[PDB]
Design an enzyme around this catalytic site. Structure first.
Site, PDB file in Angstrom:
ATOM      1  N   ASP A   8       0.852  -1.177   0.000  1.00 48.20           N
ATOM      2  CA  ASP A   8       0.000   0.000   0.000  1.00 48.20           C
ATOM      3  C   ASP A   8       0.896   1.236   0.000  1.00 48.20           C
ATOM      4  O   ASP A   8       1.496   1.591   1.014  1.00 48.20           O
ATOM      5  CB  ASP A   8      -0.949  -0.021   1.217  1.00 48.20           C
ATOM      6  CG  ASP A   8      -1.586   1.340   1.509  1.00 48.20           C
ATOM      7  OD1 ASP A   8      -1.781   2.159   0.584  1.00 48.20           O
ATOM      8  OD2 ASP A   8      -1.901   1.583   2.690  1.00 48.20           O
ATOM      9  N   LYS A  69       2.593  11.557  -3.614  1.00 46.27           N
ATOM     10  CA  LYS A  69       1.504  10.867  -4.291  1.00 46.27           C
ATOM     11  C   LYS A  69       0.545  11.890  -4.902  1.00 46.27           C
ATOM     12  O   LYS A  69      -0.181  11.578  -5.849  1.00 46.27           O
ATOM     13  CB  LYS A  69       0.746   9.934  -3.313  1.00 46.27           C
ATOM     14  CG  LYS A  69      -0.297   9.010  -3.963  1.00 46.27           C
ATOM     15  CD  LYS A  69      -0.855   8.017  -2.905  1.00 46.27           C
ATOM     16  CE  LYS A  69      -2.050   7.228  -3.439  1.00 46.27           C
ATOM     17  NZ  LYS A  69      -2.362   6.126  -2.500  1.00 46.27           N
ATOM     18  N   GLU A 173      -7.338   0.585  -4.491  1.00 46.27           N
ATOM     19  CA  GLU A 173      -7.340   0.452  -3.035  1.00 46.27           C
ATOM     20  C   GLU A 173      -8.652  -0.132  -2.464  1.00 46.27           C
ATOM     21  O   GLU A 173      -8.601  -1.030  -1.620  1.00 46.27           O
ATOM     22  CB  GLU A 173      -7.021   1.819  -2.392  1.00 46.27           C
ATOM     23  CG  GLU A 173      -5.505   2.143  -2.491  1.00 46.27           C
ATOM     24  CD  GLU A 173      -5.165   3.628  -2.349  1.00 46.27           C
ATOM     25  OE1 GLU A 173      -4.093   4.034  -2.876  1.00 46.27           O
ATOM     26  OE2 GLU A 173      -5.941   4.383  -1.713  1.00 46.27           O
ATOM     27  N   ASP A 197     -13.087   5.066   3.443  1.00 47.44           N
ATOM     28  CA  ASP A 197     -11.653   5.182   3.640  1.00 47.44           C
ATOM     29  C   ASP A 197     -11.236   6.598   4.077  1.00 47.44           C
ATOM     30  O   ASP A 197     -11.097   7.504   3.245  1.00 47.44           O
ATOM     31  CB  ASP A 197     -10.943   4.796   2.335  1.00 47.44           C
ATOM     32  CG  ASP A 197      -9.454   4.674   2.494  1.00 47.44           C
ATOM     33  OD1 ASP A 197      -8.894   5.210   3.482  1.00 47.44           O
ATOM     34  OD2 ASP A 197      -8.845   4.031   1.615  1.00 47.44           O
TER      35      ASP A 197
END
Ligand SMILES: Nc1ncnc2c1ncn2[C@@H]1O[C@H](COP(=O)(O)OP(=O)(O)O)[C@@H](O)[C@H]1O
Ligand SMILES: [Cl-]
Ligand SMILES: [Mg+2]
Ligand code: NA
Ligand code: NA
Length: 380
Positions: A8, A69, A173, A197
């Site tokens: 991850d 990211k 994800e 999430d």
């Protein structure tokens, strides 16, 4: 014979797992932490990654990179890049309409692509796995947000290849989180899964349909600038007021103090997920003044109540988009470290009228857990 790993690669924290002996093992790093900060720091003498990097962030705000990211796979003129730049302490430059992070390293100015920074994080996660397995890893599944485009996925994979990894697959994800709970094993007949999430920097709601092992993304929603760091911030501002009242000094412009407070706040916050109170004790916070104090779960909740609450309308939006009622959701899955907060779990459970939450897998580990499973499947 060598196991492939699941990684991850997170905006704020990364996580690595490996499936072996008929089970997934989430692997703790050299400090014993089951997740690792997606930080890379450059000094006069060395390059630091993960815990070592975040640990000296207050000392070296200029050459300590994070949030890569948010850049990866984007053009320099992308409005997301232009907007995000204004709030990082490190410089971002344009090289042929590609963003590069520019830093000082061993006395010289160096620039790095987002995929180079992320490869360093991936390298660390790889080394973490190899220290546990006792042999070199060469195969891996890496995850990305459902909303990532081709360019973003490409650059994420390049990061993996740069780290010395054969990237078996790039998967979403939310799909990884569903795989972790074995929801991919269903037979024929559509099941609706909602992934909630709430991580360190971003909030992602996904609704997936699973039909005989086939995933489809039905709706996505959320906020790319809502996360645990915002909860840390609310606490920072609270304690800055409290320090101002007690000592009659304003620390809010001392970047080193504020950053160190911020760190103490994240630790206390985590403690409040298991305890109803937490002790905050910083030595020499400002002008050699220590800061020993406490905060209650209920006070923490109050300071963040609106942020917590704001998480439900993206759920409503996503349900509307997917053309589903609350009642037609078969499974609810908690992902991201912030879903460990009791109040957050209460809000979502109350929203779904008392339904069970899938939370037996540490939510900040669920994505890596799933990736490790898929990696093993792809190896045989
Ligand atoms: N027990 C806990 N209680 C509250 N927040 C937590 C807990 N553990 C981790 N967090 C928070 O979760 C966030 C990181 O989420 P995570 O899913 O690990 O990373 P990412 O969002 O980058 O994928 C951080 O804001 C961190 O402080
Ligand atoms: Cl997220
Ligand atoms: Mg995440
Ligand atoms: Na993560
Ligand atoms: Na995040």
């Amino acid at each position: 014979k060598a196991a492939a790993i699941g990684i991850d690669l997170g905006t704020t924290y990364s996580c690595v797992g490996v499936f072996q002996h008929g089970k997934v093992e989430i692997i703790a790093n050299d400090q014993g932490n089951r997740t690792t900060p997606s930080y890379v720091a450059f000094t006069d003498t060395e390059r630091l990654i993960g815990d070592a990097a975040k640990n000296q962030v207050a000392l070296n705000p200029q050459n300590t990179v994070f949030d890569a990211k948010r850049l990866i796979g984007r053009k320099f003129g992308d409005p997301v890049v232009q907007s995000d730049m204004k709030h990082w302490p490190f410089q971002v430059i344009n090289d042929g309409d590609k963003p590069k992070v520019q830093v000082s390293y061993k006395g010289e100015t160096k620039a790095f692509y987002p995929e180079e920074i992320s490869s360093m994080v991936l390298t660390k996660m790889k080394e973490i796995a190899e220290a546990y397995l006792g042999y070199p890893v060469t195969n891996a599944v890496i995850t990305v947000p459902a909303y990532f485009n081709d360019s973003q996925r490409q650059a994420t994979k390049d990061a993996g290849v740069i780290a010395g990894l054969n990237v078996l697959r790039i998967i979403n994800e939310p799909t990884a989180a569903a795989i972790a709970y074995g929801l991919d094993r269903t037979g024929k007949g559509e099941r609706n899964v909602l992934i909630f999430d709430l991580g360190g920097g971003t909030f992602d709601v996904s609704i997936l349909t699973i039909d005989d092992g086939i995933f489809e993304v039905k709706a996505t929603a959320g906020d790319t600038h809502l996360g645990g760091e915002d909860f840390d911030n609310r606490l920072v501002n609270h304690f800055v007021e409290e320090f101002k009242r007690k000592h009659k000094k304003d620390i809010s412009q001392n970047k080193r103090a504020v950053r160190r407070l911020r760190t103490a706040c994240e630790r206390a916050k985590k403690t409040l997920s298991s305890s109803t109170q937490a002790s905050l004790e910083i030595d020499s916070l400002f002008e050699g003044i220590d800061f020993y104090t406490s905060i209650t779960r209920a006070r923490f909740e109050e300071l963040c109540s609106d942020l917590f609450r704001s998480t439900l309308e993206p759920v409503e939006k996503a349900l509307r988009d997917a053309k589903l009622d609350k009642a037609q959701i078969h499974d609810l899955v908690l992902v991201g470290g912030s879903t460990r907060i009791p109040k957050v779990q209460k809000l979502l459970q109350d929203f779904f009228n008392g339904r069970d939450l899938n939370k037996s897998i540490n939510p900040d580990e669920a994505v890596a857990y799933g990736a490790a499973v898929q990696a093993a499947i792809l190896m045989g």
